[PDB]
Amino acid sequence: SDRVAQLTIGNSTITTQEAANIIVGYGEWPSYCSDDDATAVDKPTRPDVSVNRFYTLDTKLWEKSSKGWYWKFPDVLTETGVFGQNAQFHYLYRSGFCIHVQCNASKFHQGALLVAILPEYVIGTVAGGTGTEDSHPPYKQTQPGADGFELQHPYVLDAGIPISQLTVCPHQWINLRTNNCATIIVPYMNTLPFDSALNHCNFGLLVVPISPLDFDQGATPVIPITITLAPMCSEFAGLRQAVTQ
Amino acid sequence: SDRVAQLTIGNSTITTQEAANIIVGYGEWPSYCSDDDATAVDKPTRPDVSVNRFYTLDTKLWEKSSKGWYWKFPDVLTETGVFGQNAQFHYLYRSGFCIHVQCNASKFHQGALLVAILPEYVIGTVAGGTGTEDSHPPYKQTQPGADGFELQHPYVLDAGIPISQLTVCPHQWINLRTNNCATIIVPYMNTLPFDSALNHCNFGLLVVPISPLDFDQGATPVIPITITLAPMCSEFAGLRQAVTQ
Amino acid sequence: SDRVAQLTIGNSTITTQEAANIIVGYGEWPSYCSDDDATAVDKPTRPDVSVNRFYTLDTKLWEKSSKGWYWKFPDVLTETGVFGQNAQFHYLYRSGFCIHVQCNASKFHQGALLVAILPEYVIGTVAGGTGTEDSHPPYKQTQPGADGFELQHPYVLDAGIPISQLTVCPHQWINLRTNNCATIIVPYMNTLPFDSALNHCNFGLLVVPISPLDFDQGATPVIPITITLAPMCSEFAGLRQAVTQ
Amino acid sequence: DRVADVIESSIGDSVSRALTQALPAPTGQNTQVSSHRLDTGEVPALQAAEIGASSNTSDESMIETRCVLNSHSTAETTLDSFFSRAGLVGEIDLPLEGTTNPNGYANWDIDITGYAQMRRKVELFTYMRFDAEFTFVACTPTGQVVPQLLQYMFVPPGAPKPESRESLAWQTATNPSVFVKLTDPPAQVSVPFMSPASAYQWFYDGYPTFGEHKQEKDLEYGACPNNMMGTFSVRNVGSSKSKYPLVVRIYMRMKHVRAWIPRPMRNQNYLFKANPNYAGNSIKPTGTSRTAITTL
Amino acid sequence: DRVADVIESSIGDSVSRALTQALPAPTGQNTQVSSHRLDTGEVPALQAAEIGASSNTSDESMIETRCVLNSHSTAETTLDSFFSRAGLVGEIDLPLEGTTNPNGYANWDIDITGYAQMRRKVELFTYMRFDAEFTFVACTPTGQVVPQLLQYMFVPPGAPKPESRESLAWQTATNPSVFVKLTDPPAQVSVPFMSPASAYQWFYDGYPTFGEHKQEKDLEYGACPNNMMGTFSVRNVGSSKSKYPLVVRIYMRMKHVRAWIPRPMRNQNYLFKANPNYAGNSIKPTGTSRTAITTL
Amino acid sequence: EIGASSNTSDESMIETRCVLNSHSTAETTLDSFFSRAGLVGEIDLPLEG
Amino acid sequence: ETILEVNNVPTNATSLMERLRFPVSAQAGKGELCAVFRADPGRDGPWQSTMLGQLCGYYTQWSGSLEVTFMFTGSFMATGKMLIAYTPPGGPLPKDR
Amino acid sequence: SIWYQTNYVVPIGAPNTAYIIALAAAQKNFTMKLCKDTSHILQTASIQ
């Protein structure tokens, strides 16, 4: 009664028989915005079930040489579903998330993925190699939406910070000999009650292989990793027309 | 909550995730010597933590043809550690033991070791084969210390007694499909409150493969067996200079 | 009932019929380490009788021209006895001492030895005579163990300090017309609850002839001085393998 | 005032933990009624020998049973019951012509491991404490009873061992002797548990000397002085030749027995006293043998 | 249940026996009246130095005395009283032309044993715990005050020690620095008892390494890391040549002092820091000398 | 994998004595750690340049 | 807890990621040595990759016990018993198990 | 130091080599005092 679990939100239900408990980001469940914390004077929309549900957005293939991937969050879920819509029509957005990364293999396979939540995950460039050029990461890299982006220098999280310390962040590992999925529940985290789901990304989801995937030849070599996230306590205010970016 | 266990004594801690309960020799925990059971009038030394701890003394390799091994006890732990010292400096010694034999393999390997505690384990010779010669087992055989000794005729425990009955002694098996270690806790057993740790061996530790080790080729063939013992309620009296034997 | 005395510790008993009372260093009996004074979190070993006893380590010959000798302490008792062992196996050591220096002669002999306890007795060199060379006393001189070392410039205790003032330290004299032995009882003294018995020497034992030995010819001329010390409230923690230095 | 770890420090507990208690077993266990049990979760029949404990499965949970009031006794399987039976342990010859024991006297080292029946029984346990009743059946080699007077003298280790039929030690001023005619019923005597140990030790894994332990001395491995009770000396009471060839059979019967640490029963033939040596080439199986595990 | 010798076993007594108590000594001891005493048996004047205790003979028992109410204070002889006086402990040069410390910055190893007056005072005791007030008097070699801005930075052992006047460590983001003009009154600061030990140790009889201890390493005998408080760095605050030659005198004044284990006062001249070496050939007596014990 | 730091106490890993830890944690607070002046800006006002 | 770079050997910049974990594989003998490291936190070495290590660099002194959890990432089928040993001060790097 | 108590055992079909990841932190009784600046790092070029 700790390795098996079921997550049910909206009209979606995730099952898992090898999970390793659930992490609750910074030990705080997602809440709605207080009356004294808010400033936007208009009564917000709380679609509830139409947006607070499990969107299974992407699948990556883990290979004996994969570097790792990340997904910026507020964004990843735009354009997809009713959530996407409310995020485009409204200026202000607010919401916590239930992230469930899954990836299974056999008892004869081995490997270990680090799954973390890095708030305000600002990306940096290699500065033209030498460090004299003041380059900047492109829209395609800082806000990749679904499909995420692949890391080029995971050791420093493409941002000059050691991944060795990335665990001071809500994390969970996917050790194949132990489990087959991670489950983080992040609350809304920003220095503001609401912000634009479009141009600001509250945090990134990191999935990095720290202990390389490996298996004797002959065992199914296609080992996918699938991301499934679900917004929680979604609130929207500041209604205008629909906006893409 | 019965196959996993942790043994902690002194500054040593053994972990096991496939153990099969703990046997307590003759159903009696090791105790200190009573005031009416003792005779030595000098106040003894009870080093406690400096000698009551887990010494991991030896490793043997189990092979598809191994005969079996034994270790005489009081002795095995001499020369090694502070225990060794107190055993050489003092004439009189007294102590119970926590013996933990470990040996793991894969779920694809198979075999079964008998692990017993035979008190007053006197060794005998083959009597020159024919039985006319009154030979005697050498110091190197009766008191092998660590490294133990290998049995030459396990069927009779090199002492003319059936191993088939060796189970009337505190024992435990290491069946590879079931566990990966044995744990016996023997109390001090002698017809005297104290005796010389040097020239008298209260009991021997037997480790014999009754069901031969076997595995299809290609699976790691080096299957070790490691002995780890820990004295308990060690008491020493009769202090003189240090003696080897 | 003040000139005769008997000291009994462990299994050792010293007798004296001409002693001149007992000095207790800084007026404090040796104690064990308090729970609020200690830091080492591991439960220590208190061998008691096996190490708290009278080791009669050395004998020097007093001659009409002897300069004086010293013994650094924590150290002097290493390698010798069970105490030695616990001091090598353990990192941390703590203990007070009962030092009994003895030396007798006839009522027709005369002389007077100063017996002091100098804490943190750092030795110094003559600096190459002139004082331009920054020489340093060798391991053989700063930590002579038993056998002690002979002073080369007693007037300054080979450390640039007047021996004339050495009495502000727990001391006692051995005036031959009065007594035949000194007895100092030093408590553990350091700025730490425990320290390495190996590389730190809490204090030195000084034995210097202030009033030269003398006697008309024909009287036995071999006048020895024997050191006998006994640890008290010995405690050891931080167990590892055995270390010499 | 104290240091806590000293107030707790359970170091010095003279009492043994136990875990098991002794219960009354006058009769065999009775059998209570059983009925069919078809349920998941409870599996008596399933055990794990690895643990090291004997299966605790009751007849009742293995088959539907009736009720049986077992009143069979267990008295005959006690130690006094089992061991308190006289048996041969020593034999002594006092021949007229020969090289064994002429001169009319003999010194028998008190060692009960010289006769296989009795030996095997006791070697069932490692330690044993008890009193005993020694009986001495003497007669000529033909089993013929003769009018001869003997003197049996127990000589504790340290007492002067008789060197001749007319030795001075036969004054037996403190040693306990017994004078008997071979025509009188066998002499019989009660012997206490005399040993410096708390129990006799059939097996002593170690040496007594404490020295070097070279090859020439491996003779002492297994020799425990706490069992060397001394010698038993006998002599025809006289100054001249006995006139008849004698033999004394020594029978010992234990009583007030306490036994501890049971060990495997002797599997092979015995070769020497106080020495478990066995014939290396003639290592026979414990029991009988068949032609196949699939046939009787 | 216990073994007695365990119930007694006073092993683990954390409290020290004592034997002596501290009494109030605000004034010197008063003198009470004395009168002639002609009696056998009581001999105050007779002592035995061998014991190892100072004579306890009172003025009263040595001569007929009057009564004196001694109200003289003992406040000036306390430790805070004695030690809490600023004294020179460090000196630093920042010359324009030279080889000592050009480049405009200096790293002074915080060691108060470089100046004989102050050193001798403290070396009176083996251990010493206390807070201190450091004052820094800066000016040119002529004692002339100049409009220059310095920066004093305390660099704990482990922090990056400045390699140049424009080093990055001068950002002093966590180290405590002090910026001062040489025209401002001397900078002064309060320093806590910062050490991993409970008291600073003037003498450490032993090594810190724990290794072999060969000849080349005897350099470390007597070096106790619990006194290595790090370095004190100073620099003229700029990018270019200071323009004036500077000198900083460091004065330390102890307060809230605790001292233990008094030892003999330094008898000979000092030769090196943290090292009691003395001139072997020039070993002068402790004091003055006369021509004979029978004349002044 | 859970994602939580090991909660194993020294006590359950070895036989321990009793220690009254009175060491403070005041110096590791935020005000304590961050409230130390540091250089953040530098400005030049040269004559020629 | 943060990742301790016990395997602080590789520097090829294409192998920086393999500092985070050390290997363990089928041995052919008895009691071989897997890895070794200074248990000092504020010192140069593996401890520098940790969050603790880094915060120490900001404080002159410290006190307290340290914990080092070792997670095994091999396959589910792999068995094994390792012996992790902390040798206090003065104890030279052990020559054998 | 980490030694092999026994050995890394594997069936035919599993990798003959795997890795261990070490993670470290301080116990509840851990405290630090007297703060200074880090040494571990110091930049080289001045921040543009």
Ligand SMILES: Cc1cc(CCCCCCCOc2ccc(C3=NCCO3)cc2)on1
């Ligand atoms: C009268 C009279 C009575 C006697 C004989 C008294 C004999 C008492 C014998 C007690 C024997 O106890 C034994 C215990 C152990 C062994 C033994 N042999 C091999 C090692 O153990 C032999 C005897 O002689 N005279």
Ligand SMILES: Cc1cc(CCCCCCCOc2ccc(C3=NCCO3)cc2)on1
């Ligand atoms: C602002 C500011 C303040 C400072 C200086 C702070 C100095 C704190 C010094 C504490 C010194 O304690 C000592 C103890 C022992 C010894 C010693 N030297 C030889 C061995 O003992 C020296 C100093 O720098 N900048």
